[PDB]
Design an enzyme around this catalytic site. Structure first.
Site, PDB file in Angstrom:
ATOM      1  CB  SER A 230      12.394  43.643   1.542  1.00  0.00           C
ATOM      2  OG  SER A 230      13.177  44.599   0.874  1.00  0.00           O
TER       3      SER A 230
ATOM      4  CE  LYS B  18      15.293  53.227   4.704  1.00  0.00           C
ATOM      5  NZ  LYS B  18      16.066  52.072   5.079  1.00  0.00           N
TER       6      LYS B  18
ATOM      7  CB  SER C 252      12.522  52.046   1.328  1.00  0.00           C
ATOM      8  OG  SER C 252      12.749  51.308   2.514  1.00  0.00           O
TER       9      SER C 252
ATOM     10  CB  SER D 268      13.509  49.579   5.156  1.00  0.00           C
ATOM     11  OG  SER D 268      14.761  49.669   4.504  1.00  0.00           O
TER      12      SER D 268
END
EC number: 3.5.2.6
Length: 259
Positions: A209, A45, A102, A42
């Site tokens: 993660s 992002k 997230s 992530s």
């Protein structure tokens, strides 16, 4: 000595650690495996949100554009989007949800809006980042299989790109400020880089993660009365079902900022 300490941390952790710190006080770097590839998870992002922000510079009301959220959009982790099924969210709201919670649906809507993973990658290239690659959407982009180059970057490249996005001129002033505000409001990072820094320091960060116990964080840091820092800490492990190790990222942050 910093190098020996990072090597010792990596050994004790059992995994593979990648670190890049840029200190804008003296234009120096601290690097550890900084040219190796790691699955971003992530942390990608940030690039997706930045691509939308860049697009908004020539489309003024882009961030207010509404996006339908449907049951068919749900993926594996949807903390915000699951509250809006059968309504719409704005692109601003999706950007905030991706960056601060997230949310994986939010990421997918940002990806789709700009044209898909290859468009996010082309945006990175336009900025001068020739290492970043976003190959897949959520949820598959964080499989993090060792040896697999999909959805990877290097610590050096990500630190340099994050510096450009948050402290440099990749984005217009309004858009840069918006990205920084979003990252400073992150809710997911208190156990990662932040946990290795003094309580008084101000941090904007994005965690990630994935499989193989992959545990990542990228941050812009304003130490008390000092020039800002950029820090990337990427970590991955040998076992497919390894558990998270946010403490390793905190330890790396402490090592590279001590003194």
């Amino acid at each position: 000595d910093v190098q020996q300490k990072l090597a010792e941390l990596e050994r004790q952790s059992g995994g593979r650690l990648g670190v890049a710190l840029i200190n804008t006080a003296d234009n120096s770097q601290i690097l550890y495996r900084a040219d190796e590839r790691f699955a971003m998870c992530s942390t990608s992002k940030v690039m997706a949100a930045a691509a939308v922000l860049k697009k908004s510079e020539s489309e003024p009301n882009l961030l207010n554009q509404r996006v339908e959220i449907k049951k068919s959009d749900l993926v594996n982790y949807n903390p915000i989007a699951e509250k809006h099924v059968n309504g719409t969210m704005s692109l601003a709201e999706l950007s905030a949800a991706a960056l601060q919670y997230s949310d994986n649906v939010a990421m997918n809507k940002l990806i789709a809006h700009v044209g898909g993973p290859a468009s996010v990658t082309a945006f990175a290239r336009q900025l001068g980042d020739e290492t970043f690659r976003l190959d897949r959407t959520q949820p598959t982009l964080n499989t993090a299989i060792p040896g697999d180059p999909r959805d990877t970057t290097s610590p050096r490249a990500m630190a340099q790109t994050l510096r450009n996005l948050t402290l440099g001129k990749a984005l217009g002033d309004s858009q840069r400020a918006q990205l920084v505000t979003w990252m400073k409001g992150n809710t997911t990072g208190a156990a990662s880089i932040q946990a290795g820094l003094p309580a008084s320091w101000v941090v904007g960060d994005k965690t990630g993660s994935g499989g193989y116990g992959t545990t990542n964080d990228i941050a812009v840091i304003w130490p008390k009365d000092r020039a800002p820092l950029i820090l990337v800490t990427y970590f991955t492990q040998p076992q497919p079902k390894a558990e998270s190790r946010r403490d390793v990222l905190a330890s790396a942050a402490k090592i590279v900022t001590d003194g």
